[PDB]
Amino acid sequence: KDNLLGEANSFLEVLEQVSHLAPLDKPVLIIGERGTGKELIASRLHYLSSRWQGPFISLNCAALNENLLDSELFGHEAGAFTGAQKRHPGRFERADGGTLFLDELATAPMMVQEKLLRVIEYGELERVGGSQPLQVNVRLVCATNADLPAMVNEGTFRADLLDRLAFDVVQLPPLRERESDIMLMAEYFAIQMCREIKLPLFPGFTERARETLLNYRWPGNIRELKNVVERSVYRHGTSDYPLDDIIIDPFKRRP
DNA sequence: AGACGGCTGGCACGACTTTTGCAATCGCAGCCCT
Numbered sequence: 276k277d278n279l280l281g282e283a284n285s286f287l288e289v290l291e292q293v294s295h296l297a298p299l300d301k302p303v304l305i306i307g308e309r310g311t312g313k314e315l316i317a318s319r320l321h322y323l324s325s326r327w328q329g330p331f332i333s334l335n336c337a338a339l340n341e342n343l344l345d346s347e348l349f350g351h352e353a354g355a356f357t358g359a360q361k362r363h364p365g366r367f368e369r370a371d372g373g374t375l376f377l378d379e380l381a382t383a384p385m386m387v388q389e390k391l392l393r394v395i396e397y398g399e400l401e402r403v404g405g406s407q408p409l410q411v412n413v414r415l416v417c418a419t420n421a422d423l424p425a426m427v428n429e430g431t432f433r434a435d436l437l438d439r440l441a442f443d444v445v446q447l448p449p450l451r452e453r454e455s456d457i458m459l460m461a462e463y464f465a466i467q468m469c470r471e472i473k474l475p476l477f478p479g480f481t482e483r484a485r486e487t488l489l490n491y492r493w494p495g496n497i498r499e500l501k502n503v504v505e506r507s508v509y510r511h512g513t514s515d516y517p518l519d520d521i522i523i524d525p526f527k528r529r530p
Numbered sequence: 531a532g533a534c535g536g537c538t539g540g541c542a543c544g545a546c547t548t549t550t551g552c553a554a555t556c557g558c559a560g561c562c563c564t
């Protein structure tokens with residue numbers, strides 16, 4: 276499919292579950308830490324999914340405000356629209372039969388929440404008069420980094436609607452918990468950045484870098500992975516000289 | 531007897547008017563161009 280970061284037993288099982296869900300057009304949930312890219316994984320699995328070649332929706336959550344699905348997802352394609360009349364494309368109508376991914380869906384308001392709840396209850400929220408229904412055939416996807424478990428417990432979203440929006444919630448475990456893909460990512464990023472930073476060679480994570488990583492809590496995980504990647508890009512040293520002090524923390528004050 | 535008067539209107543600038551000067555996107559689908 277695509278070049279992938281992480282082939283661990285957990286990562287491999289994730290790939291297997293992705294294959295299982297790929298036929299499953301029923302909406303599901305892939306949970307994980309941000310700065311990893313589970314959305315890209317969803318895109319690859321969608322290429323493997325029912326829509327082997329189909330549409331795709333990015334749909335960052337807080338990209339629409341005071342803009343209903345009717346404003347953007349449904350659109351104003353027909354005549355007699357607001358202002359002077361013309362054609363206007365709509366997302367949720369545009370990408371039927373493809374992929375419908377919701378980015379940072381945990382970042383959500385109550386009103387859009389009530390909208391999407393009915394959209395799920397009816398297949399799509401539809402437009403205008405209450406006599407008009409709709410359904411969307413795109414592969415519905417969504418993800419964020421928040422444990423909604425308490426958000427619904429706090430009522431930030433409708434708990435029943437939360438239950439409705441998916442059919443199988445899956446959570447990506449911490450890469451820091453893995454801490455084995457540490458070396459694999461280090462090497463892959465070393466090659467990629469040697470191609471990028473145009474270095475003579477990859478310095479290689481010397482003993483101190485490995486020890487620090489072993490001690491590192493790595494809160495950002497894949498986010499912290501790219502963070503350490505940039506950090507070592509700062510701490511290049513020499514292409515020959517293996518990087519023992521590879522990490523570079525911006526917050527710290529040297530000397 | 532040359533200067534006032536008041537007429538006159540030209541000279542000018544803002545305030546009410548006011549004609550005109552603007553036509554389309556839909557709707558399939560079929561027929562025509564490819």
Ligand SMILES: Nc1ncnc2c1ncn2[C@@H]1O[C@H](COP(=O)(O)OP(=O)(O)O)[C@@H](O)[C@H]1O
Nearest residue numbers: 278279280281309310311312313314315378497
């Ligand atoms: N398996 C992977 N292979 C290559 N790159 C990855 C992998 N997982 C994560 N990444 C990197 O992490 C980033 C995650 O981006 P994105 O999915 O947009 O985050 P979010 O879903 O929080 O917006 C991507 O830019 C990608 O380069």
Ligand SMILES: [Mg+2]
Nearest residue numbers: 314335378379
């Ligand atoms: Mg994103």
